[PDB]
Design a protein around this nucleic acid. Structure first.
Ligand SMILES: Nc1nc2c(ncn2[C@@H]2O[C@H](COP(=O)(O)OP(=O)(O)O)[C@@H](O)[C@H]2O)c(=O)[nH]1
Ligand SMILES: [Mg+2]
Ligand SMILES: [Mg+2]
Ligand SMILES: [Mg+2]
Ligand SMILES: [Mg+2]
Ligand SMILES: [Mg+2]
Ligand SMILES: [Mg+2]
Ligand SMILES: [Mg+2]
Ligand SMILES: [Mg+2]
Ligand SMILES: [Mg+2]
Ligand SMILES: [Mg+2]
Length: 140
RNA sequence: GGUUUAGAACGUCGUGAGACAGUUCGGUCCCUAUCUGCCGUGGGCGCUGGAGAACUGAGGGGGGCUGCUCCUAGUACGAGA
C-alpha cells in the first residue's frame, strides 16, 4: 500500500528574501536526488521550478511549486526519504503564496545570504512561519 | 542633369513683334605642361688620396578606428524591478 512509511516523510519549505538562493537550492536538490539530469540556473531561465513564462524571463518565482525527491542520505544511510519541498516566492508582492503554502508544510528551511543574511523579506517570512508555528532550520 | 543661346508647345501678358522668380520636350564642355607644386627616378660634383662595404642617426613620413559576445558577475547599487 503505502510506498514510503510516514516517518520517512518530510514536508519542507524554502522561504527566504529575494535572490537568497531558494530556487537554485531546489535545483541542486533535484540534482543530488537524481530526479533531474541537469543542475540548471535561474538567469539562464533553466530552472524547472520557475515554469511560468514570466518567472523564466524575470527570474522571479511568482508562485510556490511543490516537488518531491528521495534522498536516501549522503552515505545512503537511510532508506530513501520522500522530501516534499514547497519552494516559495520571496517577493512581498506575492505574500499569500508563501503563507498559502506555509500552513500545509510541516517544517521550514529558511535560506539567508551570507553577504546580507536577514534582509527585509526574510523578517517577513520569519513572521509568517511563527503564525503557523513551523519548527525551522536554516541554510545560509 | 540644373542653370541662363539658337527649335517647339502650354498657361498667362501684349494689338503685335515677343516676354514670364512659370512650366515643358531637345540641345558641340578644347589645350601635347615652359615655370612653381607634387609623385617617382636618375646624371654631375661635392664631402680634400682613391676604393668596397656596414652602419649611426639629426631630421621626415606612415600608423593611431571601433562593435558585439562571454568573463569578472546576476557581483556593486537597489525593499524590489
Ligand atoms: N554567487 C552565488 N550566487 C547564487 C548562489 N545561489 C544562488 N545564486 C544566484 O542568485 C540568483 C537568484 O537565485 P534564486 O535562487 O533564483 O533566487 P530566489 O529564487 O529568489 O531564491 C541566481 O542568480 C543564482 O545564480 C550562491 O551560492 N552563490
Ligand atoms: Mg533578477
Ligand atoms: Mg525563486
Ligand atoms: Mg541641360
Ligand atoms: Mg544654331
Ligand atoms: Mg525660342
Ligand atoms: Mg574635358
Ligand atoms: Mg614620429
Ligand atoms: Mg602621420
Ligand atoms: Mg551573469
Ligand atoms: Mg521590467
Amino acid at each position: 500500500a503505502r510506498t514510503t512509511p510516514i516517518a520517512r516523510y518530510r514536508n519542507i519549505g524554502i522561504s527566504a528574501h529575494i535572490d537568497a538562493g531558494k530556487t537554485t537550492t531546489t535545483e541542486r536538490i533535484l540534482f543530488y536526488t537524481g530526479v533531474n539530469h541537469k543542475i540548471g540556473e535561474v538567469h539562464d531561465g533553466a530552472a524547472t521550478m520557475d515554469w511560468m513564462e514570466q518567472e523564466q524571463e524575470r527570474g522571479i518565482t511568482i508562485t510556490s511549486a511543490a516537488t518531491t525527491a528521495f534522498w536516501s542520505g549522503m552515505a545512503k544511510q537511510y532508506e530513501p526519504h520522500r522530501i516534499n519541498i514547497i519552494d516559495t516566492p520571496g517577493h512581498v508582492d506575492f505574500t499569500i503564496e508563501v503563507e498559502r503554502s506555509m500552513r500545509v508544510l510541516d517544517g521550514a528551511v529558511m535560506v539567508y545570504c551570507a553577504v546580507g543574511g536577514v534582509q527585509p523579506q526574510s523578517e517577513t517570512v520569519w513572521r509568517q512561519a511563527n503564525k503557523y508555528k513551523v519548527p525551522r532550520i536554516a541554510f545560509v
